[PDB]
């Protein structure tokens, strides 16, 4: 088999690049507006860090 005619086509491929940058505050998500909660979370500061 020897090709005689020819055709032109366009192949489209979808590939992601990146996403969106987000920030989650540990204090605002766990306690927020409290003193004893913050004093107790101070012991778990390494986890939030």
């Amino acid at each position: 088999a020897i090709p005689t005619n020819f055709t032109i086509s366009v192949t489209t491929e979808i590939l992601p690049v990146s996403m969106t940058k987000t920030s989650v505050d540990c204090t605002m998500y766990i306690c927020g507006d409290s003193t004893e909660c913050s004093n107790l979370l101070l012991q778990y500061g390494s986890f939030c860090t």
């Binding site: 920030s23 505050d25 204090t27 860090t49």
Partner: protein, 50 residues
């Protein structure tokens, strides 16, 4: 005469076991970043605080 206030202070101890440097963690955003990173000489760059 001065009135003491409950403020978070970061201390730097030397080889003699005595306090040689104190940083007020509640005074400026740079001081807050220094207290969070537990450092005293921050380089160049952006940082996230409270």
């Amino acid at each position: 005469v001065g009135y003491l206030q409950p403020r978070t202070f970061l201390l730097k101890y030397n080889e003699n076991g005595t306090i040689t440097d104190a940083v007020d963690c509640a005074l400026d955003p740079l001081s807050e970043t220094k207290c969070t990173l537990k450092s005293f000489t921050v380089e160049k760059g952006i940082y996230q605080t409270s």
